[PDB]
Symmetry: D2
Subunit: 337 residues, 4 copies
């Protein structure tokens, strides 16, 4: 069979295929309370009906002021557990595994009131200057990721992913372009990584399941982070028990990025090879042929699909056809698939 | 602008495009109570997110023993109103109009216990022989369609379609092959049409909105009904205020049917021309080009899509692309569509 | 088997499928002598390798001043026979049948010097006013079509098509908008049809094989010709022994034409039904599904494909795949098809 | 613009895009004299009309007994020059550059009479045992490649490619599995490479244009050649002035090969990186997205397309559409592309 449709086991979780619905913000929590809405349910569950092996729920803030927008999903409150519990139950009932992306927007939070970051440096010209987190505020945030993970476990998620990419809080700490701290959380690569190190260790105190970490493998900026730096971080994450690194890139600051089909795959293959860590490839992957090639040539272990799943919720079926192979259809659509 | 994406107003309902999700049974009411489940919600709402102009909910039984299977949706009880109320609200919120198909499986009901029909004639050698409805029972069934329509109105549906096709109860009364009654509901075309006539008149006492009727325009059998018969019924339906005839075919009895792309279009075109009645074309229509041709050549007014919407929930986008035109995308997917 | 890939026999010619490469001018006779060039050979033969059932060569002038442009193909001289003989042999060798479209551009000829027409009326404000053909000149032109047909037979063509459409010479005689003659070739429909009648009768004196006539089934203009007129001409053509009417439309004069997929199909269906004449459907037919529908619903006998064959020379294979059926591939490409 | 459609210059040859028609035997020289036929002309020229940047003509034997089959093209005689001269002229006239693959089947020659190889070892159970080439016979063959190159230059080819792959003669000398010689052409890697070294040096005495070499980057067999060996050969070829290595694989002997989209790309990228040599990627590349990714991620410099160009001669257009970009169409098809 095609590798794209061959199961893979990570910890005590077996995925029926290697297609992953990349986390994508829907800005649909209209009550601004971080809760799920009917749209979210239809949005996610339809891709489970569509046979996506693993569905990763969009960035969910671990702190209200850590949201990107006031319409973001949240997991900073026990009040969020009930809705997520229904979502995981329904997604899994359709045959897919489900994960959640724990996040904090840091200096990129588009909210009124003080926003936070490792250093008081604004994202750009049109952004507010963030407040430099006190050492204790940083430690409180670590606890919030821990608390959020505990809620995710209770809600029934199969996988937890830490959002350490796209110029958000953790990414801000990792990069010297945004982290000018002179305390235990700044300076050396080890210190810049400390925030993430503590988040991983604390999350593991309440979560023993598959743990993913999404990173921006490059800042595409002089004096910023590059793949070499991330290969280093990957080795440390492996030692800590991280199961897979979801390889994205950019967004820490404005930069020129050459975008094209599979433009971030090199990051996934280099980390996989040099850090001996399973990786997720993402970035303009839109057809089954590319997906199969990435897996067969050992460039990544899972294929994250974003925008193509917005155009085609049933990408799994489309990819199967493109690869001239057969996959099980949801029972209700046996007469059409 | 392409005709497929041109609005049409029926009564007080304006459809934003001519794409209709054909009613398709999902056999997913696992509690065997005819109620909706999370699967149904995601299944239908996803096509609304997908911009389908009109979504018609699958055959919903007006009487429990009128179900095709014990996992069919139902609308025989006021308890069914709550679920449907949530569904219509959520579908309309995405920007689509919604309808429901009122039905009764007649002799094709796959349930334990007596099943009913106009005459005690089994569908085939593998089916149970139905019980001939008493005149009283027939009139009670008319009232159940009326009562069901009332529930549909309360639930917020935009359109109601009467299922008078696919060999089910109403179709059984219409055809001489299945109706050998010696009372007012059998014999001449007037008598054979009487059941449907009374259903339409009664439904109109509680529902003044768009009213569709799906028929099997031919039995493809000697001594059975053919397009000439249905043109006759269509003229009577027009006088009664039916707004559109959804043109399907067959299934009253086993028959040899030449299936091919647009194989039922001739029925929609003839009824449209000869009965001066708006029609819905359905049957192996899988792309925007065929849909546009059918509309532009005046063969039908609405394009019903069945299986292609099971393969591609976002057929509307796919069709827009095939026709080299643009249509509004759901706000949440503007970065992908 | 799909009707699109079902054989059909016209006279003594059996076509292996119903796909026809519509005649399309290539304006590539760079020596301005109407002779074939390597481009023409590869252009046509590639579609034969592509399994097209019948390839009709572009408009070939029966008189040099009857060319549309000075780079048109010609068949006004015996010197044109050698090239055509090689082309028909090579096309047939690949397994396809081949035809040629005999033509005369009339007032739409874009050449230096006097151009001719039934009446001195220019095509539009940008065109030169043609010279009214003397009765002698008209009869000489009839002989040139006859002589051209003789050359086509000698060159080995399987089918000959008379170009009586797109506002060219013959079409000009047929329509009241362009024909104001006061002799035997103008006035009543009998007189306006006379030019074509004589061409058909004379051609038949030297050619007994399949004979096609392409017409513009409507002028889309007040006081111009419409489908009713062409149904009348079609009945006369049937009596004369014409085997099939290739149904196109317009171009006699500028007009508002609603173009859409299958916009000329109604013409092919009406002529087929009312004149009991085999017809070729053409006009925005781009996929196997539409082609199959047209054939199965009895709207035409052959499917003429134009621009789609310019985008996809191997449309036959593409259509077979779309129809989920199999067709023989050229032996040399068995490892790819 | 897309890299796939950006020109690239090699020596004094500029390709308009980076799509290459991979050499593919057509077994169509029916007279068994190695000459071109009308089919060959239509076959190749149609892809030039189709905008393929570089068309590489199928394996052409440098010696009659070096043909794979008696229906192969040849270039062992001056009698072959005339036909090739017409072919290059016509392909270039349509806008493409053209190359020819100089070949010798060695022990895989399916011809009657003695066949040759470095050692008397048969390809398999159903193959004849080849005659071990005397040192002089090897030197004569080197001269034949030289002579063939001289003919190719006279015929007007833009590129010459040496076929050192697919288990044929040169490949046989390169691999220790098939080369057991104990003279100057066997033993060490240097000696096994000597035959190719001499062919390259001699060809360069009569040809100063772009020179490609196709290799089988792996024998997929224990004790056979692997990518490490070919990276070594690549460095030697670079020193000799070879411009690009066309990276295929296998066929020396029967072996288990895992085939999938882009299954030979790793060979192209490793040789490109470690030998600092331009490379051509080939092997189940069927869409523009994969092609663009290969080029943008620096895995190869040219994209060789084989079977997809047999299914779609106009792959260039299809790929352009897939990449949402525009490319010039042949003037004759401007109204369709
Ligand atoms: C509407 C939208 C919302 C997104 N939200 C998130 C998010 O919450 N978390 C994240 O890590 N990436 C997010 N992304 C980035 C995507 O997950 C994905 O990595 C990116 O689009 C590259 O992949 P693609 O080409 O398959 O879409 C978003 C992208 C889009 C288009
Ligand atoms: C799984 C399935 C369930 C269906 N259930 C219904 C139904 O409840 N009512 C109805 O009128 N037609 C029903 N149909 C018939 C379809 O609505 C449609 O008319 C038929 O599939 C022809 O169209 P298509 O070729 O676009 O699928 C069903 C079809 C399928 C495949
Ligand atoms: C470049 C080009 C040249 C054409 N030349 C001719 C011609 O010589 N004779 C003719 O009858 N139609 C000619 N046509 C009209 C086509 O045969 C065909 O009827 C028309 O394109 C409608 O079909 P299509 O939508 O499949 O392309 C031409 C069309 C194109 C695009
Ligand atoms: C019919 C056919 C003939 C071929 N002949 C040759 C040849 O003469 N020389 C060569 O180097 N490769 C030859 N090949 C191998 C192809 O060039 C190509 O490298 C292979 O098919 C892998 O690519 P693809 O997946 O794009 O077809 C041939 C392949 C096919 C299907």
């Amino acid at each position: 069979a095609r590798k794209l449709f061959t199961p893979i086991t990570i910890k005590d979780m077996t995925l029926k295929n290697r297609i992953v619905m990349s986390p994508m913000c829907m800005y649909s929590s209209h009550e601004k309370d971080g809760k799920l809405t009917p749209f979210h349910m239809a949005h996610y569950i339809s891709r489970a009906i569509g046979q996506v092996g693993l569905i990763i729920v969009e960035a969910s803030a671990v702190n209200p002021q850590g949201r990107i927008t006031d319409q973001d999903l949240g997991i900073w409150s026990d009040e969020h557990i009930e809705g997520f519990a229904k979502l995981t139950e329904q997604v899994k009932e359709q045959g897919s595994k489900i994960g959640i992306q724990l996040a904090h927007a840091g200096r990129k939070a588009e909210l009124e009131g003080d926003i936070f970051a490792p250093s008081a440096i604004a994202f750009d010209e049109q952004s507010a200057t963030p407040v430099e987190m006190s050492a204790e505020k940083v430690k409180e945030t670590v606890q919030e990721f821990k608390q959020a993970a505990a809620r995710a476990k209770e809600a029934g998620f199969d996988v937890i992913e830490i959002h350490a990419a796209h110029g958000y809080l953790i990414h801000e700490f990792l990069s010297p372009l945004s982290n000018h701290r002179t305390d235990e959380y700044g300076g050396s690569p080890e210190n810049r990584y400390r925030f993430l190190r503590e988040i991983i260790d604390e999350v593991k105190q309440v979560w023993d399941g598959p743990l993913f970490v999404r990173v921006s493998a490059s800042d595409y900026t002089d004096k910023g982070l590059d793949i070499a730096d991330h290969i280093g971080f990957a080795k440390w994450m492996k030692e800590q028990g991280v199961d897979l690194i979801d390889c994205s890139s950019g967004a820490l600051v404005h930069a020129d990025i050459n975008v094209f089909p599979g433009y971030q795959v090199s990051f996934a293959e280099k980390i996989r090879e040099q850090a001996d860590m399973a990786t997720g490839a993402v970035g303009m992957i839109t057809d089954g042929s590319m997906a199969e090639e990435i897996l067969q040539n050992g460039r990544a272990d899972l294929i994250f699909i974003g925008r193509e799943l917005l155009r085609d919720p049933f990408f799994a079926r489309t990819a199967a056809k493109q690869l001239n192979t057969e996959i099980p259809a949801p029972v209700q659509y046996e007469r059409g698939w």
